[PDB]
Amino acid sequence: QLVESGGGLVNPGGSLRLSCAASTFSSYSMGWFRQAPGKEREFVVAISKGGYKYDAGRFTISRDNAKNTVYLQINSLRPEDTAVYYCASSRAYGSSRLRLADTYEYWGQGTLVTVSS
Ligand SMILES: [Zn+2]
Ligand SMILES: [Zn+2]
């Protein structure tokens, strides 16, 4: 029900906007996670149903309910940022449990971001 878009080749120090389009979006808290080469999964950032954000300050989140979309902005890319980025939706209200993958029920396919130069 979720599709991430926008990944690609990007420069260190650059900026990148990813989008996660949802197929009743307003009733879900939305989170972004990432899996880098080697690393295990990392929480990135989440925005609750109510509009409140939970952070892991280069990664920011907005939700356009009227476009059924959540955006991840990465400002000032770093080599650590090479990863597949996953969007996820949870039926939970906002809490620090939105930093945990186990809280989410629906997930996207991921979009790959490669920091290079
Ligand atoms: Zn914060
Ligand atoms: Zn809009």
Author numbering: 4 to 26, 29 to 61, 66 to 126
Lines from the paper:
By rationally engineering the surface residues of a model anti‐VEGF nanobody, we obtained a series of anti‐VEGF nanobodies with identical protein structures and VEGF binding affinities, while drastically different crystallization propensities and crystal lattice structures. Anti‐VEGF proteins have been the cornerstone of wet AMD therapeutics, and approved anti‐VEGF proteins include ranibizumab, aflibercept, conbercept, brolucizumab, and bevacizumab (off‐label use). Here, we successfully changed the crystal lattice arrangement of therapeutic nanobody (termed mNb‐WT) by rational mutations of surface residues, which remarkably reduced the dissolution rate of protein molecules from the crystal into the solvent. In summary, our findings demonstrated that the protein crystalline form can be modulated by rational surface mutation without impairing pharmaceutical efficacy.
Unexpectedly, mutant 7, replacing Q14 with N14, resulted in a radical change to the protein arrangement in the crystal lattice. The space group of mutant 7 turned into a P212121 lattice from the P1 lattice in mNb‐WT with only one protein molecule in the asymmetric unit. The crystal morphology of mutant 7 was prismatic crystals instead of lamellae. Unlike mNb‐WT crystals, mutant 7 recruited zinc ions rather than sulfate ions to help align protein molecules in the crystal lattice. Every mutant 7 molecule interacts with another asymmetric unit mediated by two zinc ions. At the first zinc binding site, the side chain of the D60 residue in asymmetric unit A, the side chain of the D111 residue in asymmetric unit B, and two water molecules formed a strong coordination unit with the zinc ion; meanwhile, the two water molecules also created typical hydrogen bonds with the D60 and R108 residues of asymmetric unit A and the D111 residue of asymmetric unit B to strengthen the periphery of the coordination unit (top diagram). The other zinc coordination unit consisted of the side chains of residues D73 and K76 in asymmetric unit A, the side chain of residue E45 in asymmetric unit C, and one water molecule. Interestingly, these two coordination units were identical not to the conventional zinc binding motif, the classical zinc finger motif 29 or histidine‐mediated zinc coordination among protein molecules, 30 but rather to the central catalytic core of metal‐binding proteins, such as retroviral integrases. Unexpectedly, the solvent content of the mutant 7 crystal was 21.92%, the minimum among the protein crystals, indicating the most compact molecular arrangement. For the P212121 lattice, zinc coordination of the mutant 7 crystal further strengthened the molecular interaction, leading to a slower release rate than mutant 2 crystals.
